[PDB]
Amino acid sequence: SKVLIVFGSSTGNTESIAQKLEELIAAGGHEVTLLNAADASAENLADGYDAVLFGCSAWGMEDLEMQDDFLSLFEEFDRIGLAGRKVAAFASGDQEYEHFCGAVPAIEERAKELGATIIAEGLKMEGDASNDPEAVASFAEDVLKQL
Numbered sequence: 376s377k378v379l380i381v382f383g384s385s386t387g388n389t390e391s392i393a394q395k396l397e398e399l400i401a402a403g404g405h406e407v408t409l410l411n412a413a414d415a416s417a418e419n420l421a422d423g424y425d426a427v428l429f430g431c432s433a434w435g436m437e438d439l440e441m442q443d444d445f446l447s448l449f450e451e452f453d454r455i456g457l458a459g460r461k462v463a464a465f466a467s468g469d470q471e472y473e474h475f476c477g478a479v480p481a482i483e484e485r486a487k488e489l490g491a492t493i494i495a496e497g498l499k500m501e502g503d504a505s506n507d508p509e510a511v512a513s514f515a516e517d518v519l520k521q522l
């Protein structure tokens with residue numbers, strides 16, 4: 376199966392979780408493509424992919440509710456071609472804030488609205504992949520069960 380992991384990371388934690396997931400999922404025997412959202416072009420982004428994993432860290436203040444580069448992507452979700460594609464979301468954040476990883480539900484909500492099938496429960500964790508290998512690895516496993 377072909378998996379795209381697109382992520383937005385401003386201090387590298389979500390980017391870190393994305394690296395790990397690719398690792399874990401490629402060890403499942405799959406072809407994975409890692410994509411920085413700062414380098415992504417929404418238009419037809421999902422073409423050729425069996426599933427798409429979206430990573431977006433949380434930023435409560437100035438930043439309209441999401442990470443920079445992901446916000447520009449998200450806003451063009453309906454150009455991505457998610458209809459009938461497997462999708463899941465993950466994020467790094469901090470519990471000490473009122474809204475912990477609020478972009479996870481949003482991504483699931485939108486993708487679902489566009490004909491996409493959520494295959495795994497949203498990953499909400501703190502720190503990098505090494506901070507919570509177990510949470511990371513449950514997300515990957517869930518994913519691998521639908522591929």
Ligand SMILES: Cc1cc2nc3c(=O)[nH]c(=O)nc-3n(C[C@H](O)[C@H](O)[C@H](O)COP(=O)(O)O)c2cc1C
Nearest residue numbers: 385386387388389432433435467468469472475476
């Ligand atoms: C100014 C600021 C506001 C933040 N607001 C939130 C927020 O409201 N919700 C949340 O879950 N995390 C929030 N965070 C915590 C970051 O999301 C956390 O450090 C995360 O792991 C960084 O993700 P990234 O390195 O992948 O970009 C905030 C961080 C900063 C410094």
